[PDB]
Design a protein around this ligand. Sequence first.
Ligand SMILES: COc1cc(OC)cc(-c2cc(C(C)=O)n3ccccc23)c1
Ligand SMILES: COc1cc(OC)cc(-c2cc(C(C)=O)n3ccccc23)c1
Ligand SMILES: COc1cc(OC)cc(-c2cc(C(C)=O)n3ccccc23)c1
Ligand SMILES: COc1cc(OC)cc(-c2cc(C(C)=O)n3ccccc23)c1
Lengths: 131, 131
Amino acid sequence: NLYFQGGSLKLSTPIQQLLEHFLRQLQRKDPHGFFAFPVTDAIAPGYSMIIKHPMDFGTMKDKIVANEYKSVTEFKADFKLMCDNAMTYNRPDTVYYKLAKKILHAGFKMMSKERLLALKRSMSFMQDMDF
Amino acid sequence: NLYFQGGSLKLSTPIQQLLEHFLRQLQRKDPHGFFAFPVTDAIAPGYSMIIKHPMDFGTMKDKIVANEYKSVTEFKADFKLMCDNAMTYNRPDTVYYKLAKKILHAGFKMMSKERLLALKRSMSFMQDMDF
Ligand SMILES: COc1cc(OC)cc(-c2cc(C(C)=O)n3ccccc23)c1
Ligand SMILES: COc1cc(OC)cc(-c2cc(C(C)=O)n3ccccc23)c1
Ligand SMILES: COc1cc(OC)cc(-c2cc(C(C)=O)n3ccccc23)c1
Ligand SMILES: COc1cc(OC)cc(-c2cc(C(C)=O)n3ccccc23)c1
């Protein structure tokens, strides 16, 4: 199943472009990859018993690639689920709890509707120009 | 002469926003301010005899503030006039000649219609989003 356009044989949406950008920036807060892959029962005994809805950055990346996010709010919800899971399974004295708390706070600030509107407004002048 | 809008008493165009940005970046290539002010006959004997149409970054800033640039091409022309003046009055062995040549080449690359189109296209996804 193909189509021909602009001299190229073919077959990335705005939301995919936005979420790919924010996911790369959030994963930079986790240089050791603690949040990069699903938590296994081997590394975290009882995890599958305690945490009913697991989430990780790698699973969110798969959702972006497959174009399964319909809103920023859905992305932020998955992000929040990951951080809440880490702050439920792990004790407050752990790197996982402390990092989840920092990531959750920083991510919600960075992706607020009000902030994205202000960034869009700052960029609008380039769309008003003809080049 | 005033008007009231959005609860504020009033009275910056896309081209003004674009040119203010590029002028700041071009002046960063001239940290000593050699191109920041008109060349005087005191600092450059015979300048007013040799150079018929003087130009400097400070004069270009005044034009931006006064909203006197109708195109990027007009801005690039003033920039080119400044660099050509420096490469006419000064010998090739001078910092002024060498800097003018570097500024001229870098400025034309950075402000090419093709580059600005590509930057506009990279940014378009944010204008397609609703926040
Ligand atoms: C110490 O090295 C690692 C590596 C890792 O994947 C690269 C993931 C984790 C990890 C991540 C988590 C999480 C996120 O809960 N975790 C909980 C208990 C024990 C380990 C982990 C730790
Ligand atoms: C230096 O100030 C700015 C302002 C801006 O929009 C307001 C956007 C950028 C900007 C930054 C970037 C980067 C970092 O990729 N970029 C890529 C394509 C088009 C614009 C930009 C830089
Ligand atoms: C060496 O210090 C300075 C300072 C300056 O203004 C801050 C401007 C110039 C300067 C700038 C120029 C130019 C641009 O032609 N010039 C030519 C002959 C002698 C001096 C200069 C030199
Ligand atoms: C990290 O990659 C990017 C990409 C971008 O547009 C493609 C723009 C920016 C960007 C950079 C900036 C800066 C540096 O001011 N900026 C300001 C307002 C809105 C957007 C941006 C950064």
